[PDB]
């Protein structure tokens, strides 16, 4: 058997202000316990969100959502809340269970500067591979999800609650093991 590429732990290279930590600690806690509060904090009129697939509670949910006004679903800021409402209840492990998370991040150049004072702004790319417990109360469906989620963060618009915002949020829901 050929040998797969070696697997190392999370490679966290964010800038000194530790935004990746602050953001992700808030993100997964609120995703589980107070999900919609994330949007006013970090999402704005330009943020884009996709949920992709690689019985599944999320599958039936995104199906019905898409019919109404492996498979993909892309939305702008106008529908993010409504979609997030329909996504399964979750419990993620704590981020300090480090071996249960694969989080890779780095800062990168040449985003736009929303203040227009400079031609470029630095961005922060955060990619997460993790797992969570998913539940759908009505359909008595409970199980373990493996997922990927890629965030692009950048400077926020003037007046925003935080100095950074989410530009792009790409959720990939692959494996679902019933339990």
């Amino acid at each position: 058997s050929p040998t797969p590429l070696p697997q190392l732990p999370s490679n966290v290279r964010d800038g000194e202000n530790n935004v990746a930590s602050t953001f992700l600690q808030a993100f997964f806690q609120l995703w589980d316990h107070d999900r919609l509060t994330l949007i006013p904090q970090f999402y704005d009129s330009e943020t884009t969100f996709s949920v992709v697939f690689a019985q599944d509670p999320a599958s039936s949910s995104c199906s019905k959502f898409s019919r109404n006004l492996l498979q993909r679903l892309f939305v702008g800021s106008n529908l993010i809340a409504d979609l997030w409402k329909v996504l399964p209840a979750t419990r993620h492990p704590s981020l300090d269970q480090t071996s249960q998370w694969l989080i890779d991040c780095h800062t990168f150049p040449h985003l736009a500067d929303p203040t227009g004072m400079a031609p470029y702004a630095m961005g922060l790319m955060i990619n997460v591979n993790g797992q969570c417990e998913e539940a759908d109360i009505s359909q008595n469906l409970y199980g373990t999800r493996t997922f990927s989620r890629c965030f692009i963060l950048g400077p926020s618009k003037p007046g925003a609650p935080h100095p950074y915002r989410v530009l792009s949020d790409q959720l990939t829901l692959h494996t679902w093991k019933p339990q």
């Binding site: 000194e16 530790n18 800062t107 500067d113 004072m117 400079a118 630095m122 926020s156």
Partner: peptide, 8 residues
């Protein structure tokens, strides 16, 4: 310009 600080 950056809000993330310099990488270490």
């Amino acid at each position: 310009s950056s809000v993330f600080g310099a990488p270490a």
